[PDB]
Design an enzyme around this catalytic site. Sequence first.
Site, PDB file in Angstrom:
ATOM      1  N   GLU A   1      -5.160  -8.322  -0.815  1.00  0.00           N
ATOM      2  CA  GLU A   1      -6.011  -8.247   0.362  1.00  0.00           C
ATOM      3  C   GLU A   1      -7.420  -7.909  -0.067  1.00  0.00           C
ATOM      4  O   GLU A   1      -7.618  -7.017  -0.898  1.00  0.00           O
ATOM      5  CB  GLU A   1      -5.557  -7.129   1.294  1.00  0.00           C
ATOM      6  CG  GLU A   1      -4.151  -7.283   1.849  1.00  0.00           C
ATOM      7  CD  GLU A   1      -3.774  -6.169   2.801  1.00  0.00           C
ATOM      8  OE1 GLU A   1      -4.662  -5.377   3.166  1.00  0.00           O
ATOM      9  OE2 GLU A   1      -2.586  -6.077   3.182  1.00  0.00           O
TER      10      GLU A   1
ATOM     11  N   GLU B   1       0.810  -1.230   0.000  1.00  0.00           N
ATOM     12  CA  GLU B   1       0.000   0.000   0.000  1.00  0.00           C
ATOM     13  C   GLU B   1       0.846   1.284   0.000  1.00  0.00           C
ATOM     14  O   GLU B   1       0.713   2.137   0.885  1.00  0.00           O
ATOM     15  CB  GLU B   1      -0.964  -0.023   1.198  1.00  0.00           C
ATOM     16  CG  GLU B   1      -1.926  -1.203   1.135  1.00  0.00           C
ATOM     17  CD  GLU B   1      -2.980  -1.255   2.229  1.00  0.00           C
ATOM     18  OE1 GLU B   1      -2.866  -0.557   3.255  1.00  0.00           O
ATOM     19  OE2 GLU B   1      -3.949  -2.031   2.049  1.00  0.00           O
TER      20      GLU B   1
END
Lengths: 534, 534
Positions: free
Chosen positions: B266, B144
């Site tokens: 995810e 991220e």
Amino acid sequence: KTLDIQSYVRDMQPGWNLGNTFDAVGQDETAWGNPRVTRELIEQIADEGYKSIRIPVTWENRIGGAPDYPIDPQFLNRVDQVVQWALEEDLYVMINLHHDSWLWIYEMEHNYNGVMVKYRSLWEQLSNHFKDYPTKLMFESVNEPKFSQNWGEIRENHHALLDDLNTVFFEIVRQSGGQNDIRPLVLPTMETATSQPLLNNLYQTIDKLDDPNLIATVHYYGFWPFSVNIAGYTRFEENSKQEIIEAFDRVHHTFVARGIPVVLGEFGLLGFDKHTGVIQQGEKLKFFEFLIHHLNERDITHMLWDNGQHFNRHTYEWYDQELFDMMRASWEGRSSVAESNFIYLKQGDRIADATVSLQLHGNELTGLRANGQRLTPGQDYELNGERLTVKAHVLSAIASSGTLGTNGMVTAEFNRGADWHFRVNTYRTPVLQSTQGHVSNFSIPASFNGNSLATMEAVYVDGGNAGPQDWTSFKEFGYAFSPSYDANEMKLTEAFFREVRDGEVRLTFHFWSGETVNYTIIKNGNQVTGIAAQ
Amino acid sequence: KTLDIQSYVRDMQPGWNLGNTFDAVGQDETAWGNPRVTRELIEQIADEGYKSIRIPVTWENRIGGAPDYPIDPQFLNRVDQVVQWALEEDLYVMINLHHDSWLWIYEMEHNYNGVMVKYRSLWEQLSNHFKDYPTKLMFESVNEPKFSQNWGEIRENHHALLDDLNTVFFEIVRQSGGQNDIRPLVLPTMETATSQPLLNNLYQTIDKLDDPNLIATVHYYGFWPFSVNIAGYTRFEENSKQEIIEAFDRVHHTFVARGIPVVLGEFGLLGFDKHTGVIQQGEKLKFFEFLIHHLNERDITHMLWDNGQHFNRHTYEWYDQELFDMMRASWEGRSSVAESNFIYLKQGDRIADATVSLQLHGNELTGLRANGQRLTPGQDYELNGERLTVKAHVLSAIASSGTLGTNGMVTAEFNRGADWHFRVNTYRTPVLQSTQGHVSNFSIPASFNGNSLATMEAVYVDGGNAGPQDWTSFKEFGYAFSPSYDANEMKLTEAFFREVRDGEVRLTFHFWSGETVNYTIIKNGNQVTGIAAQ
Ligand SMILES: C[As](C)(=O)[O-]
Ligand SMILES: C[As](C)(=O)[O-]
Ligand SMILES: [Ca+2]
Ligand SMILES: [Ca+2]
Ligand SMILES: [Ca+2]
């Protein structure tokens, strides 16, 4: 201590390239006809008023193989010696990787790690070798980067590759020790071109690196058709002027005005790659005057591309003193120019007053000389606004003999800037002769009769332009044709004929006197018949 | 030998994250409440049908200082042991740098070389340590990535930084030896987000690297308001459905269809960071069914984010078997769902036939059970198109007692996919009571009376929305308020009151039965008076 990058770049003005030397593709720096570098050359360039020197270096052919690519120490020491001489003469110095750009760096698109390994190795070696040198030595990542074998084929992925090359160069140098944590680094746009997207991409890279000692570089060789003499662009006119203004406005707005200094690392006219005579002398002078003025206005440091053709490296003088004088004047301010650097007189006609338009550029006319002799205002000449009249009796004194060609000179003197020189030329209608020949060695017998050739058109009599670059009737000077004044011949090259189909072609020769002469060629295979106007 | 990257990614399906473990910010992997990893956990996850495991690792706090940043060998050996166990269980394994993203990597914009030195060191060490491991172990550059301390502040310069991180990671791994010349590498978009510009930028980077074994990664936690239960998005509806279709269409078009495989590294619902109960159970199930179907359609491999809240790591079973059963069914194909997972009966009213809309998703209803007892078609229920009617006598048998809350279950069975479970609930109007309290611990005495709370609105009686996120009247479940069913209390949080001005606020509690209850609060400093509807 701290370094002021803007002051640094300003202090480089003006610059000069040691061209076709260490950049030459060959065993050594004499491969392209220049002599080994002498200390005297560097001294002489410094004495002419240059404050910086670019030493382009091609490392290919002077390096070992993978994986370490060791630089030949003997070659490196010779480059080093020249760097030292320049620094001893108080010059700033720029070194780079030069024709490595198209010899191998361009492969990066389909050989990412292979190119990166070699590039990294070279900059690791150079950064280490030069790490303790004065910061007046600066590094330039790569000359004129591109990722096709051809110019003008910049694809989206190429921008990312250039960012990576610039970035790895930065990383290597900045962490290599000595003075390299602060040494100024010079980063190019793609192709060293000036289009907005390319300027934006370089700005993005410079912004990212978050470093106060970065210099942007671009190159400039003039509006293309004027620069090579094709398509009728024999004069320095609005297209060439506007390209300079627009391009350097972009450069100033994107870089200089935001605090990123710019070095114009090379400039000249592209056609000089043929020879300096392909651009009419007066128009050549006005190009340089105008360019350098607009660079001055925008705080852009410039470095002349000199491949050996400007400064005579054997005798240490300028081949063209008029060009140098114009450049040197332009370093300080504007010079007054005129519509032409000539006044033509038709042999046999009564000599009249010659009136020419000057572009004063903020200066005042202080005097006029005819073959060095001071002329009397009013009596011998008049200036009305920017219209200069040279009286008939002055021209008659210079050229009453009617000998063809240049009889003498009228020199305009101004309160500032370079003198402007009008060559006073006597001419008659030029005459071409019918002939027959072969495409490999075709010469039209030609009596130039005091005329200078400006350009040549070629069209098929049935319709359409003939020869190379057939989007225009006006062929490229030197490439497609050439006047041989001493031989009294007009040459049409093999390259011209390679792009001419069999059939009949009308040629039109345009001379600077205004004389126009038509000529016919008939091509039948490799054989060419020439037929003079009748 | 050669590797087929598309087959490799397909063979990973489905995946599971060992969340809040080695990624935990602390001395060790138990810092966030999960136990040390046992071999049994990995065995059990494999036995549930997972073919890949993501092992996120935060290296900060387990590394030395500059310049070498040596990884604690003890920590590395523990990570290594888990990698080995997973590989022994025939799983694919992904490791990364995880919360390093916001602990230090984000600094890169104003600390380019400092971040690069540390990042390079870590990937040099990991690539070397794991170089001889099977290629079923893959590396992911950074979790991220972003370059602000905040989300949703992606600036133009940030894209260039992420390209550099991805690129240096590639260079390091690919030249580090062993199997790392071909080991698959996983590269993220900025914030692992899916907007077109971010997908384009990752594509540009992948295209540039000119390597056949690259995998694109994004993450996905649902349409934001639904995912956290705010703004009235208590149902899985058109906005959540369309976001999935649009986002993964972009992902498929940009990557998958061009031969670059995608791992959804995810997924889950963002609100689960509070707890899994913040999303209504039936709506939660439909989200997962729909998401996984659309990932299957687009050949996207998915890895469940499990921070410890899904698979019970102490007893090795699912906390929510219904959720797991839906996910497991979805790996193979679609499951039939319904408008709700409940049938409400008002206590005291005559029990009538309940008709509910099914979404068959290509399946057929094969039967219905009431508390496990097979029901008779026609007699006990009817299916007319997708309208399922459960007859009154069935509901009366389950719920004639009129005990409040869940009385029993009607289970719909289908020829394919998971059973759908209707909770049969008896309710009365819920009752809230007047009270007085403090902002730090304010509870409304509440008789839920068999009801489940869906959401709560808060508006100033004088006009305007009250409390956090005041662009909507519907407050965030858990964050601003919470039902305490066992305590018989409705909690209004301190965080709610921090964004409420003194004055009078009307609350509206919406229950899944359709019951709506208004309530008034008057805030005077830290003191709150609650006034029940009258
Ligand atoms: C041929 As060139 C672009 O180096 O002047
Ligand atoms: C708090 As998160 C974006 O790692 O689920
Ligand atoms: Ca880059
Ligand atoms: Ca003067
Ligand atoms: Ca079934």
